[PDB]
Structure formats: structure tokens, C-alpha cells
């Protein structure tokens, strides 16, 4: 009988044990960190098997009293939506430990401690049902990622990236917190189930929804505030750059799918056109901006912004197709962006350029990496048979059930997405070599050729047979779309 609490406790135990041992025995530290991450991953997979997809009510709930009145308490629990995010965040962490495996003697035990703390905290975010405490853990990731970015980051601009990242998550976060307090005082509890079954004032839902969106429009790279992701993502370590675009960008969308869509249904309808316009202009502007980039990191950071913005079009189009495609494209992006940023990281850790023009015509020298990069940028294209296509086409279908203009612009997003993706591919892997500044360089060793194998198998499994993933969520998605819609 494996419950939800053991999954949360495993990274905690791994971190506490790791602090006991000293730093001289570096091999023990890395071995124990990897072992803890892998057993957490296995536990997450075990939780998948024993998941009832028929019922609409939440799975394993562990309640730990927080206030003396049991007014609000840690109410853990997974559903069709939160399960796959938990699996993805358990899967990404061992990869994070494995990418920087060679440099562990340079980082130290603070690196694995920070990453395991991140795993614990990120798991706690997705699988909990208390609105207020979810806010606490929602921006609790500030400290560990601030440490990760600042301590091991850029050369001298690492300070500014940390400040922009930390500043963008303050005003909107606390402006959300004000709405949290108004909800707590108005109803009385922050339990999600109780808050769903409450009559909110017609004028009140507008203010609360705006406050929620203000703190989610920063995590999801919306039009006003999305410039942090490129700069704070290039000025970030490779393992810190693979969860920043792998998990953090999901907090805004998941928060929309949990505490925004259900609680404020008619407010969602009234604010629907505005979100459509924002997402469409974000897609178009980011697509046009990313095709004249020379930074080796921002080139796909903008692709991540475009995908996340396209997610909201079908996430806010209340529909079984739209929301299902939303989470499918979300997982697909969590895999493909992670793979692309790992490719950029391995390219950077050999040559240390952070440019695009330096690399050129290296297919004759690194053929394995060439094939892997081709497959990853091929998945980014959203080919049928790859991960992105099923989800993204489902989003297009769902939005075209509701509206006929904005998501046509969303589809026009991919008329240039694929173009600049292959153009970017052809900057590097094509043409004649330039051995004026590329004297010596090697191909992927045993570690980083095996690290992509889970990515490859997950990508093809998404592409050719996504029925198993859609199977476990159709109850939760349909319950989500029909809430507060009696007729």
C-alpha cells in the first residue's frame, strides 16, 4: 500500500541523509542523490498503476491539521490532471542530477540538496487540494531556484537574472494573495471542494479572477511579462534550465486548470476574448522575434513561450478536446523543451560559446548527436507520430469548436514555428565545417547518449499511442468543463 505521503517524504529523506555525510566522499553524495531520485521516480510510476480513472473524486488524500480549528490543513490528493504532472516532475529530477554528473566535484552537495528540495516542493505543489497552502508552495520555489541560478550561473550578469526572476514573482504573487485572503474571509475555508460549491457574487468573480490571472500571467509567459524567461534562462545552469522550462511553466497553466476555471465559470466566459487576443499576439510576436536570434539558449526559450501561449487557447476554450489537448501538449512540451535544452547544454559544455554562428557543419563529426537533435527539433515541429502533434491539434480542434478567428492565428503560429525550427537546425548541423575555432571536440559519451533514451521512448509513446494518457483524464477533464454549468 503505497500512499501519496511516501512520495513526498522520499526526497526529504534523501536530502536529510545527504546532509549527514561530509563533502570529502563525493561519490557517496552523488550516488545517494541519484538513488533517492530514482526510487522517487519508481514510486511515482507505482502510484500511476493504482489510479482509478472511472471515479471523479480525488485519489489518496492525506490530511494534516494546520490551524487549530482544522479550518485549513494540508489536503493532499491527485486526480487525472495532477497525476501526470507528478510523474513528469519525478522523471525530470534524476535527469537533472545526471546531466551535471561530471562536474559534481565542482558544485558540491549544495547542488543535489537544492535539486532534491526542488523535487519535494514541486511534488507538493501539484498533488494538494488546499487553495491557500498551494499558494504557499506555489512561490516557495523562489528560494531554491534563486540559489541554483545565482550560485552557479552566468559570468557576471547572474545577479541581474536572479533579481528579474525574483522581482517578477512578487507584485503579482502578493496581489494574488490579497484575493486568497478575500476568499478565505468570505467563504471561511480554503478547501478546494468547499470553494467549488460556493455562490460567488457576480461582480466579485471579476476581481478575484483578475487577481488570480495576474500571478499566473507571469509564470505562463504572457505578452506583458515574458522577457524574464529568455534572459533568466540563458543566464542559468543547464540542469536549472531544464526544470525552469519543464515544470515552472506548468504552474500557471495548472493553476488556471485548478483554481481559475472551476471557481469562476462565468468570469471565464466574460474574459475569454481577452485571453484569446493575448495568446494570439504572443504566438505571432514570439514567432517573428525568435527567427532573428543569435543566442544559443533564447532560440528555443522563445519556442517554449510560443507553446505555452498556445496551450492557454485551448485551456480556456471550455471543451473536452481543448483541455485534454492542453495537458497533452503540456507534457509534450515538458519533454521536448527539456530535450532541446539538454542538447544546448551538452553543446555549450564542450565549446563554451553560447552563440549560434560558431557552430556549423558538425554532422560529419558528431552523427549521433546530429540524429538526436534532428529527432528533438522534429518533435518540436509537431509531426503526427510525435508528442506535440496530438495535443496541439486537439487544442486547435477544441478552440475551433468555440471560436473561428483566434485559433486560426494559433495555427498560423506553426506556419512559422516549423520554418524557423528547421532553419535553426540547418544553422548548426549543415554546411561545410569551419576548423578555425573548432579544433577539437567529441561526441556524446555513454551518459548523455543514454539520457535521451527515456526522452525518445516517451516521445514515440506519446506520438503513436496516446490513448493510455487520455484514458485516465477524460473523467477529470469532463468534470472540470461541466462544473457550474447546470442546464
Amino acid at each position: 500500500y503505497f500512499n501519496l505521503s511516501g512520495l513526498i517524504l522520499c526526497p526529504v529523506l534523501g536530502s536529510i541523509i545527504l546532509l549527514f555525510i561530509p563533502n570529502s566522499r563525493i561519490r557517496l553524495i552523488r550516488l545517494i542523490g541519484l538513488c533517492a531520485s530514482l526510487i522517487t521516480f519508481l514510486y511515482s510510476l507505482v502510484l500511476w498503476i493504482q489510479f482509478d480513472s472511472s471515479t471523479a473524486k480525488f485519489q489518496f488524500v492525506e490530511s494534516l491539521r494546520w490551524l487549530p480549528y482544522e479550518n485549513i490543513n494540508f489536503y493532499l490528493g491527485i486526480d487525472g490532471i495532477s497525476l501526470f504532472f507528478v510523474i513528469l516532475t519525478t522523471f525530470l529530477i534524476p535527469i537533472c542530477i545526471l546531466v551535471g554528473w561530471s562536474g559534481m566535484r565542482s558544485y558540491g552537495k549544495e547542488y543535489i540538496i537544492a535539486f532534491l528540495i526542488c523535487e519535494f516542493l514541486m511534488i507538493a505543489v501539484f498533488c494538494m487540494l488546499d487553495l491557500l497552502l498551494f499558494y504557499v508552495f506555489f512561490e516557495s520555489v523562489l528560494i531554491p531556484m534563486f540559489i541554483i541560478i545565482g550560485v552557479w550561473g552566468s559570468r557576471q550578469r547572474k545577479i541581474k537574472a536572479a533579481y528579474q526572476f525574483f522581482l517578477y514573482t512578487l507584485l503579482g504573487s502578493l496581489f494574488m494573495l490579497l484575493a486568497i485572503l478575500l476568499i478565505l474571509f468570505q467563504t471561511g475555508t480554503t478547501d478546494l471542494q468547499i470553494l467549488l460549491t460556493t455562490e460567488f457574487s457576480e461582480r466579485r468573480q471579476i476581481f478575484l479572477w483578475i487577481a488570480f490571472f495576474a500571478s499566473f500571467a507571469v509564470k505562463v509567459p504572457m505578452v506583458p511579462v515574458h522577457i524574464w524567461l529568455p534572459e533568466a534562462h540563458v543566464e542559468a545552469p543547464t540542469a536549472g534550465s531544464v526544470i525552469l522550462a519543464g515544470i515552472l511553466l506548468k504552474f500557471g497553466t495548472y493553476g488556471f486548470l485548478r483554481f481559475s476555471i472551476p471557481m469562476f465559470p462565468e468570469a471565464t466566459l466574460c474574459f475569454t476574448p481577452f485571453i484569446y487576443t493575448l495568446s494570439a499576439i504572443a504566438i505571432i510576436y514570439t514567432s517573428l522575434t525568435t527567427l532573428r536570434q543569435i543566442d544559443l539558449k533564447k532560440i528555443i526559450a522563445y519556442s517554449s513561450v510560443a507553446h505555452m501561449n498556445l496551450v492557454t487557447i485551448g485551456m480556456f476554450s471550455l471543451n473536452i478536446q481543448g483541455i485534454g489537448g492542453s495537458i497533452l501538449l503540456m507534457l509534450s512540451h515538458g519533454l521536448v523543451s527539456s530535450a532541446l535544452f539538454l542538447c544546448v547544454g551538452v553543446l555549450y559544455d564542450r565549446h563554451k560559446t553560447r552563440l549560434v554562428r560558431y557552430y556549423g557543419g558538425l554532422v560529419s563529426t558528431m552523427p549521433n548527436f546530429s540524429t538526436i537533435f534532428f529527432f528533438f527539433t522534429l518533435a518540436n515541429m509537431s509531426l503526427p507520430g510525435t508528442s506535440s502533434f496530438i495535443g496541439e491539434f486537439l487544442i486547435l480542434v477544441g478552440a475551433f469548436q468555440r471560436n473561428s478567428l483566434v485559433a486560426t492565428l494559433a495555427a498560423l503560429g506553426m506556419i512559422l514555428g516549423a520554418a524557423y525550427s528547421l532553419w535553426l537546425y540547418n544553422r548548426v548541423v549543415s554546411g561545410n565545417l569551419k576548423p578555425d575555432f573548432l579544433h577539437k571536440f567529441s561526441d556524446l559519451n555513454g551518459r548523455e547518449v543514454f539520457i535521451f533514451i527515456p526522452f525518445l521512448v516517451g516521445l514515440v509513446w506519446m506520438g503513436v499511442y496516446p490513448k493510455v494518457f487520455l484514458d485516465c483524464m477524460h473523467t477529470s477533464v469532463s468534470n472540470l468543463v461541466q462544473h457550474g454549468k447546470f442546464h
Binding site: 471579476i206 466566459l269 466574460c270 475569454t272 476574448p273 481577452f274 484569446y276 487576443t277 493575448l278 494570439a280 499576439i281 510576436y285 543569435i294 543566442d295 564542450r350 565549446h351 563554451k352 560559446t353 552563440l355 554562428r357 560558431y358 471560436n403 473561428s404 478567428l405 483566434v406 492565428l409 578555425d436 575555432f437 573548432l438 579544433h439 577539437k440 571536440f441 567529441s442
Partner: protein
């Protein structure tokens, strides 16, 4: 293994990175920023809202306020 990194590249790379020092609110560029900052969002907003209005007109249901 590290690249030679010839000097005639990092200057242009930083110029692309540090473009924030070249902006003086020129009138032509002020119109250029204003149009793509406001008008196109307004035009597309009218597009979606009128698409919803025309969809609702055929069904006969009253139009949502859509504030």
C-alpha cells in the same frame, strides 16, 4: 576544446544583448511601437468579439456582455 572565439563576434553579440541603451522615443518608432502595442490588439479583440456576436446572432440567444 574551447573555441578560439575571435574578437570580431562578441562585440556584435553584446550589441544584440545590450540593445537597451539605444532607445530615444523617435516619432516614427513611437508610431511603430504604438500601433503594434495597441491597435493590433484592439483590432484582433474586435475580431473575436464580433465573431462571438455573429455566432450568437444566428442561434438567437442574447449577446453576452463580454466586459
Amino acid at each position: 576544446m574551447e573555441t578560439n572565439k575571435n574578437k570580431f563576434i562578441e562585440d556584435w553579440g553584446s550589441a544584440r544583448e545590450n540593445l537597451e541603451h539605444n532607445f530615444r522615443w523617435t516619432r516614427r518608432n513611437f508610431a511603430l511601437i504604438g500601433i503594434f502595442g495597441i491597435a493590433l490588439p484592439i483590432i484582433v479583440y474586435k475580431g473575436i468579439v464580433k465573431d462571438f456576436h455573429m455566432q450568437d446572432e444566428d442561434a438567437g440567444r442574447p449577446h453576452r456582455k463580454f466586459l
